[PDB]
A paper describes a structure:
Therefore, we directed our efforts toward the extracytoplasmic region (PrgKEC), as well as its individual LytM, SLT, and CHAP domains. Crystallization trials yielded crystals of the PrgKLytM domain, which were used to solve the LytM structure to 1.5 Å. In agreement with bioinformatic predictions, our crystal structure confirms that the active site of LytM is degenerate as it lacks the conserved HXXXD and HXH motifs required for zinc ion coordination at the catalytic site. This is not the only characterized LytM domain with a degenerate active site. Sequence alignment of PrgKLytM homologs shows very low sequence identity, with only the region encompassing the HXXXD and HXH motifs being conserved. The His and Asp residues that are important for catalysis are only conserved in active homologs, but not in PrgKLytM and other degenerate homologs. The crystal structure of LytM superimposes well onto the AF model with an r.m.s.d. of 0.43 Å. Only one structural homolog was found in the PDB by using Foldseek, which is the geneproduct 13 (gp13) cell-wall degrading enzyme of bacteriophage Φ29 (54). gp13 consists of two domains, one N-terminal lysozyme-like domain that is homologous to the MUR domain (RMSD of 1.5 Å), and a C-terminal LytM domain (RMSD to PrgKLytM of 2.4 Å). However, the muropeptide profiles of the PrgKSLT-CHAP:C766A, H828A and PrgKEC:C766A, H828A fractions after incubation with cell-wall extract are similar to their wild-type counterparts. In line with this result, the LytM and CHAP domains showed no activity against the sacculi. In conclusion, the LytM domain of PrgK has a degenerate active site and might play a regulatory role.
In the T4SS from the enterococcal conjugative plasmid pCF10, PrgK is known to be the active cell wall degrading enzyme. It has three predicted extracellular hydrolase domains: metallo-peptidase (LytM), soluble lytic transglycosylase (SLT), and cysteine, histidine-dependent amidohydrolases/peptidases (CHAP). The pCF10-encoded PrgK is essential for conjugation and belongs to the DELTA family of larger PG-degrading enzymes. To conclude, we here show that PrgK, an essential cell wall degrading enzyme of the pCF10 T4SS, has muramidase activity instead of the lytic transglycosylase activity that has been shown for other T4SS cell wall degrading enzymes.
Numbering used by the authors:
A (entry chain A): 273 to 529
B (entry chain B): 1 to 257
């Protein structure tokens, strides 16, 4: 009862990444010559999971009249406003506005923040260990949509900054299933998860070799490493991309509004 | 990047509708007493966007000798043949002809089709929600040109099949800016988008009312509802029609060759 605590994130993994991506679509579509949007989508997703539990983008709200894409779009407007004179608010601000739809009562909000901090995304399956000694990966290109060369583009991974060719250890246990070139490897846990790593020297690795979490793979080749992460969907015997950032202990985003 | 994915639709919205409309002009011009053409223009547009990115009808192709109107006209002939013995083909079939300018290697064809399924037109701005509970609007009169009375006509909207006397909810957030008659309303998101709805009784509705996505507007009068949708061009301070079908989650076209 009061001894029972729901996790900070309860959505299924595919829906969690889909909801992230939907919000990056709204950021990217409003990004133009005069405005660059990189909302704090983590704060959005923690709020949405607290309010709406294990929602899917096409489920209906409590009125029965709108789906969660619409709810997310309305939230985007509450945070960022509209052309020409956009606004910039935080989720915390909306959650403390007593007239707002997003309001959370003072005492409940203390508990909500504690659980968000204590549990985070660490209840997801198939978490990834840091590949270097650090307290947070610095993410200079987040997952999802953005504008690049004035054009909408979907980035199905994350770019991370790794200084000084640090020795790079595997984030996951699995088998090396592909070594396409000298700087790309694919590690797969059969029918579970698949991690693609770009930017690490692969000279001491061949297809079929088993690696464990922490196995040294090689030194980082330049300053950026790219991760892509996929989960397996038994129902259709295929794979879907997930946002890798959710699966490491902590990241720091360098792109912000 | 291998981690970078372009959308299924890359064209600007005005160019996308203009390309649709051009193809409907070709279908309508060749429709006669013995042949009625309603090509699968969605398949055309997804192929063209994959092959030629954010093209405009009057742009020249890479050879510099033909514009995209000419390319679309040549494709119509490849898909449909010529008088007096028309022969219907599919876009996917044309992509396997190694002697044709439409060839796409098998893997890339499968991949762009998968992206078409995942993304569709959902990367366009200012999407519309279904006005009733459904997985697809049945469109029995599509946007663009057709023949009526052996006369060419341009239809700047779509007609959708909805059961008569059924509750109808708003596809869009905005203000009711016009209530012309007891069966017509116009909703405007100011200087963004304008939605005309014909066939919903508007007696509970007044000019100046705010609506959200999902707001009950009224019950349907007849067995179809007509939508028109316009976007705003700040450069000229005017509006232009777009094909409304692109903006809903899914449609089913009843008019086929």
């Amino acid at each position: 009862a009061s001894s029972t605590q729901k996790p900070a994130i309860v959505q299924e993994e595919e829906d969690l990444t889909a909801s992230w991506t939907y919000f990056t679509k709204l950021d990217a579509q409003h990004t133009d010559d005069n405005n660059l949007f990189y909302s704090n989508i983590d704060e959005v997703l923690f709020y949405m999971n607290y309010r709406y539990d294990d929602f899917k983008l096409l489920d209906m709200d409590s009125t029965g009249t709108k789906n969660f894409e619409t709810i997310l779009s309305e939230l985007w407007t509450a945070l960022n406003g509209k052309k020409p004179d956009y606004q910039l608010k935080t989720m915390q601000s909306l959650e403390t506005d007593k007239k707002s739809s997003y309001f959370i009562e003072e005492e409940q909000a203390k508990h909500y923040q504690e659980i968000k901090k204590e549990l985070g995304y660490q209840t997801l399956d198939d978490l990834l260990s840091f590949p270097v000694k650090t307290d947070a990966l610095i993410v200079n290109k987040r997952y999802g949509y953005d504008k690049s060369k004035e054009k909408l583009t979907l980035y199905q991974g994350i770019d991370v900054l790794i200084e000084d060719n640090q020795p790079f250890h595997s984030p996951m246990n699995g088998q090396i299933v592909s070594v396409p070139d000298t700087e790309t490897l694919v590690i797969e846990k059969e029918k579970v998860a698949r991690l693609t790593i770009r930017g690490v020297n692969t000279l001491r690795l061949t297809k079929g070799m088993d690696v464990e979490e922490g196995t040294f793979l090689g030194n980082t080749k330049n300053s950026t490493v790219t991760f892509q992460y996929e989960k397996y969907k038994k129902e259709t015997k295929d794979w879907f991309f997930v946002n890798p950032a959710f699966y490491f202990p902590r990241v720091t985003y360098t792109q912000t509004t």
